[PDB]
Structures are given as C-alpha cells and as structure tokens.
Write a protein that binds this ligand. Sequence first.
Ligand SMILES: O=C(O)[C@H]1O[C@@H](O)[C@H](O)[C@@H](O)[C@@H]1O
Ligand SMILES: O=C(O)[C@H]1O[C@@H](O)[C@H](O)[C@@H](O)[C@@H]1O
Ligand SMILES: O=C(O)[C@H]1O[C@@H](O)[C@H](O)[C@@H](O)[C@@H]1O
Ligand SMILES: O=C(O)[C@H]1O[C@@H](O)[C@H](O)[C@@H](O)[C@@H]1O
Ligand SMILES: O=C(O)[C@H]1O[C@@H](O)[C@H](O)[C@@H](O)[C@@H]1O
Ligand SMILES: O=C(O)[C@H]1O[C@@H](O)[C@H](O)[C@@H](O)[C@@H]1O
Ligand SMILES: O=C(O)[C@H]1O[C@@H](O)[C@H](O)[C@@H](O)[C@@H]1O
Ligand SMILES: O=C(O)[C@H]1O[C@@H](O)[C@H](O)[C@@H](O)[C@@H]1O
Ligand SMILES: O=C(O)[C@H]1O[C@@H](O)[C@H](O)[C@@H](O)[C@@H]1O
Ligand SMILES: O=C(O)[C@H]1O[C@@H](O)[C@H](O)[C@@H](O)[C@@H]1O
Ligand SMILES: O=C(O)[C@H]1O[C@@H](O)[C@H](O)[C@@H](O)[C@@H]1O
Ligand SMILES: O=C(O)[C@H]1O[C@@H](O)[C@H](O)[C@@H](O)[C@@H]1O
Lengths: 5, 5, 5, 5, 5, 5, 5, 5, 5, 5, 5, 5
Amino acid sequence: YYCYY
Amino acid sequence: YYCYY
Amino acid sequence: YYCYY
Amino acid sequence: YYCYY
Amino acid sequence: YYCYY
Amino acid sequence: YYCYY
Amino acid sequence: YYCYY
Amino acid sequence: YYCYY
Amino acid sequence: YYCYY
Amino acid sequence: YYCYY
Amino acid sequence: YYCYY
Amino acid sequence: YYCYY
Ligand SMILES: O=C(O)[C@H]1O[C@@H](O)[C@H](O)[C@@H](O)[C@@H]1O
Ligand SMILES: O=C(O)[C@H]1O[C@@H](O)[C@H](O)[C@@H](O)[C@@H]1O
Ligand SMILES: O=C(O)[C@H]1O[C@@H](O)[C@H](O)[C@@H](O)[C@@H]1O
Ligand SMILES: O=C(O)[C@H]1O[C@@H](O)[C@H](O)[C@@H](O)[C@@H]1O
Ligand SMILES: O=C(O)[C@H]1O[C@@H](O)[C@H](O)[C@@H](O)[C@@H]1O
Ligand SMILES: O=C(O)[C@H]1O[C@@H](O)[C@H](O)[C@@H](O)[C@@H]1O
Ligand SMILES: O=C(O)[C@H]1O[C@@H](O)[C@H](O)[C@@H](O)[C@@H]1O
Ligand SMILES: O=C(O)[C@H]1O[C@@H](O)[C@H](O)[C@@H](O)[C@@H]1O
Ligand SMILES: O=C(O)[C@H]1O[C@@H](O)[C@H](O)[C@@H](O)[C@@H]1O
Ligand SMILES: O=C(O)[C@H]1O[C@@H](O)[C@H](O)[C@@H](O)[C@@H]1O
Ligand SMILES: O=C(O)[C@H]1O[C@@H](O)[C@H](O)[C@@H](O)[C@@H]1O
Ligand SMILES: O=C(O)[C@H]1O[C@@H](O)[C@H](O)[C@@H](O)[C@@H]1O
C-alpha cells in the first residue's frame, strides 16, 4: 500500500 | 494524491 | 487496485 | 477520480 | 458482507 | 471500493 | 467494521 | 483507505 | 501476484 | 481485499 | 509478503 | 490492514 501524496 | 494499494 | 484521485 | 481495480 | 466495488 | 463487513 | 478503500 | 472499526 | 478483492 | 504477493 | 487489507 | 512480511 503506498501512497504518494 | 494517488494511492497504489 | 490503484486509485488516482 | 478514477480507480483501476 | 457486502462489497460495493 | 467500499466494503461493509 | 466498514472500510472505505 | 480509511477504516472505521 | 494474486489479489482477492 | 487481500493480496498475496 | 501478503497483506490483508 | 495487517501485513505479514
Ligand atoms: O517521486 C519522488 O519524489 C519519490 O517517489 C517515491 O515513490 C520513490 O520511491 C522515490 O525514490 C522518489 O524520490
Ligand atoms: O500522474 C501522476 O502525477 C502520477 O500518476 C501515477 O500513476 C504514476 O505512477 C506517477 O509516476 C505519476 O507521477
Ligand atoms: O506499476 C503498475 O503495475 C501500474 O502502476 C500504476 O500507477 C500505473 O498507472 C500503471 O500504468 C502501472 O501498470
Ligand atoms: O491499461 C489498461 O489496460 C487500460 O487502462 C484504462 O485506464 C484505460 O482507459 C484503457 O484504455 C486501458 O486499456
Ligand atoms: O447505490 C447504488 O447505486 C446501489 O447500491 C446497492 O447496494 C443497492 O443494492 C442498489 O439498489 C443501489 O442502486
Ligand atoms: O461517500 C461515498 O461516496 C459513499 O460512501 C459509502 O460508505 C456509502 O455507503 C455510499 O452511499 C456513499 O455513496
Ligand atoms: O451503517 C453504518 O454503521 C455505517 O455505514 C457506512 O457506510 C456509513 O458511511 C456510516 O455513516 C454508517 O454509520
Ligand atoms: O463517527 C465518528 O465518531 C468519527 O468518524 C470519522 O470518520 C469522522 O472523521 C469523525 O469526525 C467522527 O467523529
Ligand atoms: O475462495 C473462493 O471463493 C475462490 O478463491 C479463488 O482464489 C479461487 O481461484 C476460487 O477457485 C475460489 O472459489
Ligand atoms: O480470513 C479470511 O477471511 C481470508 O483470509 C485470507 O488470507 C485467506 O486466503 C482466505 O481463505 C480467508 O477466507
Ligand atoms: O501461504 C502463506 O504463506 C500464507 O498465505 C495467507 O493467505 C494465509 O493466511 C497464511 O496462513 C499462510 O501462511
Ligand atoms: O505466524 C506468526 O509468526 C504470527 O502471525 C501473526 O499474524 C499472529 O498474530 C501471531 O500470533 C503469529 O505468531
């Protein structure tokens, strides 16, 4: 799960 | 904002 | 599953 | 908002 | 259990 | 995608 | 328990 | 992704 | 890679 | 949603 | 590596 | 969300 804000 | 679950 | 808001 | 499941 | 994709 | 368990 | 992905 | 337990 | 939604 | 990489 | 969201 | 590496 990786988020790039 | 993009998330890769 | 990847979402691009 | 587009999601690619 | 109900999922709404 | 939202699930309600 | 409800999750909103 | 937010879950409300 | 297998996902079970 | 469970993924097994 | 297995994740259970 | 629990991951078992
Ligand atoms: O675009 C970025 O700044 C960063 O994005 C992340 O996903 C990459 O792992 C990192 O190496 C990049 O520096
Ligand atoms: O359009 C964007 O900003 C981003 O969209 C994501 O899906 C791509 O993985 C990333 O490389 C892009 O920078
Ligand atoms: O790395 C991936 O498998 C995917 O990552 C997503 O962000 C991109 O939009 C998609 O084109 C790629 O196929
Ligand atoms: O990468 C893909 O297979 C698909 O991704 C979707 O977002 C595009 O609308 C579609 O035209 C592509 O064929
Ligand atoms: O919100 C919706 O569009 C739909 O959501 C589903 O869960 C309901 O069973 C269906 O009757 C609704 O039309
Ligand atoms: O905020 C949303 O888009 C959705 O969030 C879900 O939890 C609700 O069951 C659905 O009726 C909403 O349309
Ligand atoms: O039924 C429930 O407990 C919950 O279901 C979720 O989808 C709604 O977003 C939340 O407002 C409700 O409190
Ligand atoms: O229902 C709740 O207690 C909480 O649910 C969260 O999603 C809301 O962000 C928060 O403002 C509420 O206080
Ligand atoms: O557990 C399940 O319902 C399903 O899980 C999938 O991964 C299997 O390919 C399918 O044969 C099963 O019926
Ligand atoms: O605990 C669960 O509901 C699920 O957890 C997953 O990791 C298992 O592959 C699946 O067979 C189970 O049904
Ligand atoms: O195959 C595996 O290593 C693992 O796959 C997961 O889905 C099961 O929940 C876990 O008990 C197994 O040890
Ligand atoms: O398999 C393991 O080592 C561990 O996996 C975790 O998910 C269990 O909560 C923990 O009790 C086990 O000891």
